[PDB]
XYZ file of C-alpha atoms in Angstrom:
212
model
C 121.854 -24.318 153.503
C 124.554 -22.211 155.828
C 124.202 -21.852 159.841
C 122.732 -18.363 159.256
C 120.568 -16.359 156.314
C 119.717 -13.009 157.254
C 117.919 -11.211 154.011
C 118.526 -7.946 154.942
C 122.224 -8.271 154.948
C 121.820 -9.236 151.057
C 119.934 -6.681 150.145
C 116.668 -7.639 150.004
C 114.699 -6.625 152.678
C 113.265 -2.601 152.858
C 112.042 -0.474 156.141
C 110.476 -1.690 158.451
C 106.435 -0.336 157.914
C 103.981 0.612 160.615
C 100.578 -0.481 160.115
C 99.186 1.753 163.051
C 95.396 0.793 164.267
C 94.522 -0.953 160.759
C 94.797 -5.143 161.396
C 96.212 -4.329 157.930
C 99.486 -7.318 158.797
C 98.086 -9.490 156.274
C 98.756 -7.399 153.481
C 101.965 -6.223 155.261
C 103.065 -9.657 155.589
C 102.914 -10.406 151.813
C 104.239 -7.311 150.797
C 107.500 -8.013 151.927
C 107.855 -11.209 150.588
C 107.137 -10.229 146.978
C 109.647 -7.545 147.639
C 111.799 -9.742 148.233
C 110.933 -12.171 145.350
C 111.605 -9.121 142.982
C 115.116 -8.500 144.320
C 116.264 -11.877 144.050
C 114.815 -12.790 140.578
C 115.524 -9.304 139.157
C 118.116 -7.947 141.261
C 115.490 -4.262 141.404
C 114.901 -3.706 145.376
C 111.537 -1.880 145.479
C 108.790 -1.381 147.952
C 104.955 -2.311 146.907
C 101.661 -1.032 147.704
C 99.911 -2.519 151.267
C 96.757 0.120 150.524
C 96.310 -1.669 147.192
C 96.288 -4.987 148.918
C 93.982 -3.814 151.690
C 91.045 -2.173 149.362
C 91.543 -4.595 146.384
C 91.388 -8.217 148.299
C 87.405 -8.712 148.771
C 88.504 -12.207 150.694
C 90.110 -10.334 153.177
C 88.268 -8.233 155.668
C 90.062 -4.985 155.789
C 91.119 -3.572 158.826
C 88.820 -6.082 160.396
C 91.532 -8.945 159.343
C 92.293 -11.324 155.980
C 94.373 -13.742 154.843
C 98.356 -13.839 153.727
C 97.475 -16.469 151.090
C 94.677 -14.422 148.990
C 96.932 -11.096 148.911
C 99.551 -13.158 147.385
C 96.960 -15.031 145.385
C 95.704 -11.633 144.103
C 99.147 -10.510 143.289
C 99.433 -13.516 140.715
C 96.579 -13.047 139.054
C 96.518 -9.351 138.720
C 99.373 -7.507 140.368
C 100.901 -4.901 142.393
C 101.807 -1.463 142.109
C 104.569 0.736 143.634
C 104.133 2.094 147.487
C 104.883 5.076 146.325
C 102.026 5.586 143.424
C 99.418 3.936 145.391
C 100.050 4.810 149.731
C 99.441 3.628 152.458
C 96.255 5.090 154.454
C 95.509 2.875 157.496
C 91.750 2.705 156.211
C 90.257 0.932 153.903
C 89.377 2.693 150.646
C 87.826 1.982 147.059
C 90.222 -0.269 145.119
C 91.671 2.339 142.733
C 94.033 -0.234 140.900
C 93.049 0.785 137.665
C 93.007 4.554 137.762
C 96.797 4.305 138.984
C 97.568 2.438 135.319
C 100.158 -0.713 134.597
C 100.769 -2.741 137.299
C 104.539 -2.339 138.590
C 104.644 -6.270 139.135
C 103.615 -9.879 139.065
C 104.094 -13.179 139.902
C 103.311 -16.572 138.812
C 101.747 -18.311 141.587
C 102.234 -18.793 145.278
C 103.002 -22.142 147.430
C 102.580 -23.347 150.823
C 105.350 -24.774 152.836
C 104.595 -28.407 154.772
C 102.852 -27.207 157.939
C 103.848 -28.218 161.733
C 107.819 -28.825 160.657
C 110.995 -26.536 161.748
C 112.975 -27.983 158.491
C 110.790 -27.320 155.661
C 110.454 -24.127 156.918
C 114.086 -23.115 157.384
C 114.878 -24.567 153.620
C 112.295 -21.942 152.460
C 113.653 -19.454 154.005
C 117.134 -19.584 153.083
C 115.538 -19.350 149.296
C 113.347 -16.417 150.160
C 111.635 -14.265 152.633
C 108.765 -16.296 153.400
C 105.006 -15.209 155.001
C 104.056 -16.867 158.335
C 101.535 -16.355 161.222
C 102.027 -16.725 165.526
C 100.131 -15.230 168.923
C 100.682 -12.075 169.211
C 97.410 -11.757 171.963
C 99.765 -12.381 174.925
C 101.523 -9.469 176.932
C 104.890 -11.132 176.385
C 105.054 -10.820 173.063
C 103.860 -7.125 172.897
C 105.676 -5.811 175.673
C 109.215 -7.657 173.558
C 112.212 -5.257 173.783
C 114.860 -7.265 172.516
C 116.662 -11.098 172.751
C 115.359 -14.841 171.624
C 112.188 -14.595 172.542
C 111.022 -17.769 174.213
C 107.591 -16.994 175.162
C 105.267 -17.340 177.209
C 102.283 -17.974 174.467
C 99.935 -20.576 173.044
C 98.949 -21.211 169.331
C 96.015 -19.291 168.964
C 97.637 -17.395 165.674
C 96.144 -14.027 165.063
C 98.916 -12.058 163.306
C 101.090 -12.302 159.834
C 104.304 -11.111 160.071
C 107.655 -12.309 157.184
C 110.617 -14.524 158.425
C 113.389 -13.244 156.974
C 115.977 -15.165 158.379
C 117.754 -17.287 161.222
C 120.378 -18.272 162.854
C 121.432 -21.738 165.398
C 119.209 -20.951 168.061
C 116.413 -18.834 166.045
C 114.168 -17.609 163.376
C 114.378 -13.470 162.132
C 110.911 -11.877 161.960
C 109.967 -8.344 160.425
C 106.936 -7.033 161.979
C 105.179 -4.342 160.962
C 104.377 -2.063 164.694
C 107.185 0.217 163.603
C 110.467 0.793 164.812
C 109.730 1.194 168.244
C 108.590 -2.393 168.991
C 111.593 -4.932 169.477
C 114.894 -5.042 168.025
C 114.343 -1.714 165.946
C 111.113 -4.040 164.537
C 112.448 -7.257 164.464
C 111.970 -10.073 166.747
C 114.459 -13.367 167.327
C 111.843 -15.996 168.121
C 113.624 -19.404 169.309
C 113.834 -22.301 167.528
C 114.679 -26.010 167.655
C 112.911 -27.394 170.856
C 111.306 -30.556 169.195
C 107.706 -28.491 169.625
C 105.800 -29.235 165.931
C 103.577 -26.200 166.607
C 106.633 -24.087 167.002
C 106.592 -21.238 169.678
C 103.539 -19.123 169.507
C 102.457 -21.243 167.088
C 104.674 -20.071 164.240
C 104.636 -23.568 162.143
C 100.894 -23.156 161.370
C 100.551 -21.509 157.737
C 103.625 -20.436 155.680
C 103.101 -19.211 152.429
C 105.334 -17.568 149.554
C 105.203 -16.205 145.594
C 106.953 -18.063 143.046
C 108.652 -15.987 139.944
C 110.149 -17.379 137.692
């Protein structure tokens, strides 16, 4: 797999999204990696609907929190319209799937990668864009303006956010506060320091669609 994968630079990564006061990054989170599943099985870059995700998942808790895995689950078994016939609202709303008519897309199923190792997870994401979780609590990480971030934080993970990417000394992370949060949304966490957990915990749950 080469020294560094950045997604974006092939095409297959879209704006960055801003979720505002909705805890909506779950749905965020798998958005972007079916996005990116699309453009590399299809070659069609298109954006799909977070709102869909956030008032059709009845696993998932709304704005109140849910779960990567079951948005990507739902997906599979039913799935996903276009961002731009079903909009994002930053509250949660009646699932109106049905009154916005065929689905735009779907995939066949969705896999986790081996928890609590760097390698597995750098395979997966030179393959795809990939969903995983970290601490996001801790004024260090929200106050982030730019460079490898090397913490401070512990592993109590509390936000979903897409690696899309790395490079020697780190892993390339689209989160969804907007623009004006990091590295024009991104953040360079570091990488290889023999830690399983990985730093803020980012090793913990990794999860991405298959299509085939």
């Amino acid at each position: 797999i080469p020294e560094y994968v950045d997604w974006r630079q092939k095409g297959a990564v879209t704006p960055v999204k801003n979720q505002g006061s909705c805890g909506s990054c779950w749905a965020f989170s798998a958005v972007v990696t079916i996005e990116g599943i699309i453009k590399i099985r299809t070659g069609n870059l298109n954006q799909y609907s977070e709102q869909e995700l956030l008032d059709c998942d009845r696993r998932s808790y709304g704005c109140n929190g849910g779960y990567p895995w079951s948005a990507l689950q739902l997906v599979a078994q039913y799935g996903i319209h276009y961002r731009n016939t079903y909009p994002y609202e930053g509250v949660q709303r009646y699932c109106r799937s049905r009154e916005k008519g065929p689905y735009a897309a779907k995939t066949d199923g969705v896999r986790q990668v081996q928890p609590y190792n760097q390698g597995a997870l750098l395979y997966s994401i030179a393959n795809q864009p990939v969903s995983v979780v970290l601490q996001a609590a801790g004024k260090d990480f929200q106050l982030y303006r730019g460079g490898i971030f090397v913490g401070p934080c512990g592993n109590k993970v509390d936000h979903a956010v897409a690696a899309v990417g790395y490079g020697p000394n780190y892993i390339l992370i689209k989160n969804s506060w907007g623009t004006g949060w990091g590295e024009n949304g991104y953040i360079r966490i570091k990488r290889g320091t023999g830690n399983s957990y990985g730093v803020c915990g980012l090793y913990t749950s990794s999860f991405y669609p298959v299509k085939n």
